Amino acid sequence: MKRVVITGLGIVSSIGNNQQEVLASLREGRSGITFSQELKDSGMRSHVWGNVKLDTTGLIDRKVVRFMSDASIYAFLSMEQAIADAGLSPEAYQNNPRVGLIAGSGGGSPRFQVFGADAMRGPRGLKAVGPYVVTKAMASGVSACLATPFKIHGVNYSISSACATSAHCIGNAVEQIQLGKQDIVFAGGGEELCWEMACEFDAMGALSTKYNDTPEKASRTYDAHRDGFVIAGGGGMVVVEELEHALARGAHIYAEIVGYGATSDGADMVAPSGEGAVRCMKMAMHGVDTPIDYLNSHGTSTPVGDVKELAAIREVFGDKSPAISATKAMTGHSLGAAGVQEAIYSLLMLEHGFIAPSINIEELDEQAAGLNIVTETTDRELTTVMSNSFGFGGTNATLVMRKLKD
Amino acid sequence: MKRVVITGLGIVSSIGNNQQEVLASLREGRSGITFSQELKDSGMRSHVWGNVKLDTTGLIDRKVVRFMSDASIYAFLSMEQAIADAGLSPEAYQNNPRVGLIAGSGGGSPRFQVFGADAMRGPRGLKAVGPYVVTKAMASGVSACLATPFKIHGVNYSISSACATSAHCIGNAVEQIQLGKQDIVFAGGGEELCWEMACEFDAMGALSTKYNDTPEKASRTYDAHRDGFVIAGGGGMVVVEELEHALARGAHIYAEIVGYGATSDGADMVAPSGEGAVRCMKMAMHGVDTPIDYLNSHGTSTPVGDVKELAAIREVFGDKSPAISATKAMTGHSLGAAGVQEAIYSLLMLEHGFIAPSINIEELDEQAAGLNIVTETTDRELTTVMSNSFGFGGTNATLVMRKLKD
């Protein structure tokens, strides 16, 4: 019966290496997509990506970083930011059984899986593989690599659900607190950016390929000429905390998590049914007495997906369409890190009072007609915001966050 | 405040392809470890494994199986068994928002990650990769591939936590019911068996290498000459259901889940601290008014691990040491599938009234002195059983199950 609030945030993405840079990008509709020589050289048709523009060299202690893959590094850097932003000191969160960590990635580390296989087939065998590939490649790398250095004693595991990954991590963190098991749970995720994983999506025809010469226009949610998502990477982390506990320490509260929906389509393996999304949004709005002012859509910029989601939104809201914008048009699709990053973009909009634009729409899709899709930065006092995450395998997640009465 | 029971089970392991074969093996102390030509040819030092002796060819519909890797296949076959065992008909669990699925694997699919990378580097590029590698390789493949064919509408995601993976899946399934969100949750996991993933553990020195010529004696938990675990694969799945709901339909109840502990060491990345295990077992016994009759230990057959756990058990029980046996001596370590498989071995013991033997102990370790480690099949009425799962990254899980008063 506990109330749950977010008291700190951290982020490393294609549009910024901290919340200050991300905020500026969001206000300006600044694209984080660039041309990738790595993707091109691999033989892929998609040569654009949402890359993290930061050299992480030396940013993490040698003895800690030896066990990590990029998803973990990104998540680790985001957690450090979150801890500082939350105002937490070591004695408050370390070696404390009421403090946990739930963070994951959608793909683990294809790069280190392959590195290990290649090394093993070489003339050096096991010696070339080394003793650190396991923690780099295992699916729970993101949580294992963070829980250990930060001395976490509470829950510790990774949740994985493709594009919905980090949204479920936050939702499950919420449940641990409601259940009275934890006081604080660091929730989020990370994802590496590499051709080893990207080629898989390109082979499936999911990625954009017609705008390689104009990377900033490849990701274009709702535009009539969109042709797939633009892959990205990065990390994000939020401090999910129980209300009394947060108030007792004088924490700064960004918002209260008032709704969480998690459903399944039980239909198609790669395309959304729309029906599961309807159920998901309704579940999250259950008991939310205020209207939704802004909705950060999943909108990956794919022909079928953008539309199914728009159809589900009409079903749920009918004529009360809330303001809508797809930030993926600026950032690209970070897969496992999308859920937490997009929850962070929404919290910043709620905190600073503006709606980030849905950029690159040259010709609005017909099925988007009649909806309030915001295409230019607009200042507006927001109170209740919603963020959708629908992943492959038909797994859906929706989070609803609302300002806590001052 | 709901009570949670287990009403059905399914299993595909090194010691049996169904619960009937597993039961016979457990009663006889029959080893499921064999010599692996695949492991030897790869250049590894460990040439033994706990393989699933079943040809899964044609066992799953073509259109469903095209998206799956072995972990998913093993988990899929286990679910079918569990549904039949639970007495559930399609109209009861399909397209039902109160029925969910939480299942994962520890490594996803190293085999298909590598296959995709190798194909991409060949002369055929993307054409050689194909459109199915994503669902095969993504970390949530096990849940995504099962939720879709079985028409699941409730929760759908994968939990990953190395050796504790499927134990957390079951514990999280329990919480969904206690929260009143679901009536039934299929919980479990699977893990593929391949050199691509095994070499990573061998490179780290975790696997047994001194008994390749006598495979049946390689896994020897508590023996003084153990030298590492024996890797295995397979799957398992249990039907976690709310009590009233189960009684209302006349379900057969194997046991009630009376305790679930989930902790973190926050110490070593690969070795257990023992302190996190103490806290984990205590949390799971919280409020359990009956003594633990039998404890299915994590016991992987490693020098340091077996001992830390034995030390934690002494700390918790002192002089009330319950009967103890490590079934991994017979089955090997199935990683992500270990948790649910071992919960199934314990349920069969509770249901049939016997304690499976801890085999291969020729010379008992000194630190095991004074504990009731069962080395031969012994018939005994059991009432409350406990099963431990401690994984890399210092993530712990303990489940406590008890017979429901007739």
CA distance B305 to chain A (A): 17
State how far the Cα of B366 lies from the Cα of B224, in Å rounded to an integer: 8
State how far the Cα of A142 lies from the Cα of A109, in Å rounded to an integer: 10
State how far the Cα of B307 lies from the Cα of A130, in Å rounded to an integer: 26
Q: Which two tokens stand for residue A181?
A: 């098991």
Q: Which residues in chain A are contacts of B137 at CB distance < 8 A?
A: 107, 110, 200
Substitution target in B160, B178, B192, B268 with the highest count of A β-carbons within 10 Å is B160
Q: What are phi and psi of B2, to 5 degrees?
A: -70, 150
Query: Which residues 151-210 in chain B show a CB within 8 A of chain A?
Result: 151-162, 164-165, 168, 172, 175, 178-179, 195-196, 199-205
State how far the Cα of A213 lies from the Cα of A201, in Å rounded to an integer: 20
C-beta of residue B399 within 8 angstroms of C-beta of residue B175: no
Active-site choice (B47, B145, B163, B168): B163
Q: Which residues in chain A are contacts of B45 at CB distance < 8 A?
A: 126
Pick from B62, B138, B119: nearest CA to A203: B119
C-beta of residue A192 within 8 angstroms of C-beta of residue A71: yes
Q: A263-281 in b/e burial notation, b at 16+ Cβ within 10 A?
A: bbbbbebbebbbbbbbbbb
Active-site choice (B47, B145, B168, B333): B333
**Residue A156 and residue B117: Cβ atoms within 8 Å?**
no
Method of elucidation: X-ray
Identify the H or E element spanning A44.
Answer: none
Q: Which residues in chain A are contacts of B398 at CB distance < 8 A?
A: none
Q: CA–CA distance from B353 to each of A126, B27, B347, B349, B356 (Å)?
A: 45, 11, 10, 5, 10
All domains in chain B, ordered by first residue:
6-259 (3.40.47.10), 260-404 (3.40.47.10)
Q: Which of A113, A125, A267 sits opposite B113 (nearest CB)?
A: A113
Identify the H or E element spanning B187.
Answer: strand B184-191
Q: Residue B252's CB: how many other CB atoms inside 10 A? A: 13
Q: Which residue has the tokens 């049996």?
A: B16
C-beta of residue B390 within 8 angstroms of C-beta of residue B396: yes
**Residue B140 and residue A178: Cβ atoms within 8 Å?**
no
Using the Cβ of B130 and the Cβ atoms of chain A, whether some distance falls under 8 Å is answered with yes
CA distance B217 to chain A (A): 24
Q: How far apart are the first and last CA of chain B?
A: 21
Whether A286 is catalytic is: no
Q: What are phi and psi of B47, to 5 degrees?
A: -120, 25
Active-site choice (A47, A194, A280, A298): A298
Provide the strand spans (E) within B282-353. 294-296, 323-325
Identify the H or E element spanning B105.
Answer: none
Q: Which residues in chain B are contacts of A126 at CB distance < 8 A?
A: 43-45, 199, 202-203
Q: Between vectors from CA B50 to CA B48 and to CA B55, what angle results, nearest 5°?
A: 115
State how far the Cα of B360 lies from the Cα of B222, in Å rounded to an integer: 9
Active-site choice (A47, A145, A163, A199): A163
**Sequence-distant (≥ 6) Cβ neighbours of residue A213 within 8 angstroms:** none
CA distance A375 to chain B (A): 33
SS3 state of residue A39: helix
Q: Residue A321's CB: how many other CB atoms inside 10 A? A: 17
Q: Which residue has the tokens 């949610």?
A: A221
Dihedral angle of Cα B267, B270, B275, B277, to the nearest 10 degrees: 140
Indicate the burial class of B326 (C-beta count within 10 angstroms; 0-12, 13-18, 19 or more). Answer: buried
| Strands B184-191, B99-104: pairing kind | parallel
Q: Between vectors from CA A88 to CA A172 and to CA A94, what angle results, nearest 5°?
A: 70
Which residues are registered as beta bridge partners of B181?
Answer: none
Q: Which residue has the tokens 């199986």?
A: B65
**Residue B266 and residue A153: Cβ atoms within 8 Å?**
yes
C-beta of residue B355 within 8 angstroms of C-beta of residue B372: no
Whether B298 is catalytic is: yes
Give this entry's resolution in angstroms: 2.3
**Sequence-distant (≥ 6) Cβ neighbours of residue B219 within 8 angstroms:** B31, B33, B50, B208, B229, B230, B301, B328, B329, B330, B331, B332, B333, B360
State how far the Cα of A143 lies from the Cα of A173, in Å rounded to an integer: 13
Q: B119-152 in b/e burial notation, b at 16+ Cβ within 10 A?
A: bbbeeebbeebbbbbbbbbbbbbbbbbbbbbbbb
Which residues are registered as beta bridge partners of A43?
Answer: none
Q: Which residue has the tokens 């071995």?
A: B345
**Residue A394 and residue B126: Cβ atoms within 8 Å?**
no
Q: Cα B374 vs. chain centroid, distance in angstroms?
A: 21
H helices within B61-132, ranges in order?
62-65, 70-86, 90-93, 110-120, 126-129
State how far the Cα of A306 lies from the Cα of B244, in Å rounded to an integer: 41
Q: How far apart are the first and last CA of chain A?
A: 21
State how far the Cα of A259 lies from the Cα of A398, in Å rounded to an integer: 8
State how far the Cα of B116 lies from the Cα of B126, in Å rounded to an integer: 9
Q: Cα B388 vs. chain centroid, distance in angstroms?
A: 10
**Residue B153 and residue A178: Cβ atoms within 8 Å?**
no
Widest CA span of chain A, in angstroms? 66
Q: Residue B372's CB: how many other CB atoms inside 10 A? A: 14
Pick from A66, A70, A76: nearest CA to A103: A76
Q: Which residues in chain A are contacts of B110 at CB distance < 8 A?
A: 113, 116-117, 137
Pick from B235, B219, B230, B232: nearest CA to B358: B219
Q: Which residue has the tokens 């504790």?
A: B164
3-state secondary structure B194-213: CHHHHHHHHHCCCECCCCCC
State how far the Cα of A246 lies from the Cα of A244, in Å rounded to an integer: 5
State how far the Cα of B251 lies from the Cα of B4, in Å rounded to an integer: 13
SS3 state of residue B241: strand
* Total residues belonging to chain A: 406
Pick from A158, A131, A173: nearest CA to A75: A158
Q: Which residues in chain A are contacts of B162 at CB distance < 8 A?
A: 138, 140, 144
Widest CA span of chain B, in angstroms? 66
Q: CA–CA distance from B149 to each of A14, A268, A269, B63, B187 (Å)?
A: 36, 9, 9, 10, 16
State how far the Cα of B22 lies from the Cα of B27, in Å rounded to an integer: 9
Q: CA–CA distance from A217 to each of A11, A14, A28 (Å)?
A: 24, 15, 15
Q: CA–CA distance from A72 to each of A50, A79, A134, B398 (Å)?
A: 18, 10, 13, 26
CA distance B297 to chain A (A): 20
C-beta of residue A222 within 8 angstroms of C-beta of residue A368: yes
Q: Between vectors from CA B359 to CA B358 and to CA B364, what angle results, nearest 5°?
A: 80
Whether B163 is catalytic is: yes
C-beta of residue B222 within 8 angstroms of C-beta of residue B300: no
State how far the Cα of A8 lies from the Cα of B95, in Å rounded to an integer: 38
C-beta of residue B382 within 8 angstroms of C-beta of residue B321: no
Query: Which residues 256-315 in chain A show a CB within 8 A of chain B?
Result: 262-270, 276, 279
Pick from A92, A385, A91: nearest CA to A251: A92
Which residues are registered as beta bridge partners of A377?
Answer: none
State how far the Cα of A349 lies from the Cα of A25, in Å rounded to an integer: 12
State how far the Cα of A73 lies from the Cα of A78, in Å rounded to an integer: 9
State how far the Cα of A354 lies from the Cα of A24, in Å rounded to an integer: 12
Q: Which residues in chain B are contacts of A268 at CB distance < 8 A?
A: 148
Q: Which residue has the tokens 């250990």?
A: A148
State how far the Cα of A117 lies from the Cα of B354, in Å rounded to an integer: 43
Q: What are phi and psi of B323, to 5 degrees?
A: -65, 145
Q: A153-180 in b/e burial notation, b at 16+ Cβ within 10 A?
A: bbbbbbbbbbbbbbbbbbbbbbbbbbee
Q: Between vectors from CA B123 to CA B118 and to CA B125, what angle results, nearest 5°?
A: 60
State how far the Cα of B184 lies from the Cα of B181, in Å rounded to an integer: 9
Q: Which two tokens stand for residue A403?
A: 């300002």
Query: Which residues 1-60 in chain A show a CB within 8 A of chain B?
Result: 42-45
State how far the Cα of A37 lies from the Cα of A15, in Å rounded to an integer: 19
Q: Which of B132, B137, B153 sits opposite A266 (nearest CB)?
A: B153
Angle between helices B110-120 and A195-203 (to 10 degrees): 80
Q: Residue A37's CB: how many other CB atoms inside 10 A? A: 9
Substitution target in A95, A161, A279 with the highest count of B β-carbons within 10 Å is A161
Q: Which two tokens stand for residue B317?
A: 């029980």
**Residue B195 and residue A120: Cβ atoms within 8 Å?**
yes
Q: What are phi and psi of B222, to 5 degrees?
A: 80, -15
* Total residues belonging to chain B: 406
State how far the Cα of A16 lies from the Cα of A20, in Å rounded to an integer: 8
